[PDB]
């Protein structure tokens, strides 16, 4: 009953953060990122990935 | 608190008290099936 998008529908989230990195578990070259920096500042970029076809999760360690 | 100064037994009956003790004689041996067979004798 509201006049703006109160919640998503089952298709209304189509991400596009394509980097051309190799996937071992499903070969989907497309793979998004997520924007964080986890450890204390004696540690590299913890700015993650996430594989986009088989549901594999990836950690950007260093 | 389970004691009485006049009968100098426990407040539970001397067949209820003997029933639990005689199970604990069995359970200091490696047998549990024969421990629940002592409750088959109630007459």
């Amino acid at each position: 009953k509201s006049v703006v998008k109160t919640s998503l529908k089952k298709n209304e989230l189509k991400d596009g953060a394509t980097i051309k990195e190799k996937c071992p578990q499903c070969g989907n070259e497309e793979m998004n990122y997520h924007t964080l920096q986890l450890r204390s500042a004696d540690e590299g970029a913890t700015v993650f990935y996430t594989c986009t076809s088989c549901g594999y999760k990836f950690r950007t360690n260093n | 608190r389970a004691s009485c100064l006049f009968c100098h037994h426990f407040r539970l009956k001397s067949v209820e008290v003997h029933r639990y003790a005689c199970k604990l004689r069995l359970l200091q041996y490696g047998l549990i099936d024969e421990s629940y067979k002592l409750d088959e004798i109630t007459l």
Binding site: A41, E43, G44, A45, N62 | -
Partner: protein
Amino acid sequence: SSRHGQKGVCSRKWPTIDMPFSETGIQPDIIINPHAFPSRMTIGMFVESLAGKAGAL
């Protein structure tokens, strides 16, 4: 430490004879490993490094 956050221990006091000379015969002072940078991405150390050239005259 430099002024960009690159700490590091003085791992080994290295003799100046077995240490690479340069254009002139200049031998360096602090060898820092270029594998340290891509986890850090401190390009401010790279632009400080060539403007120290361009400040030294």
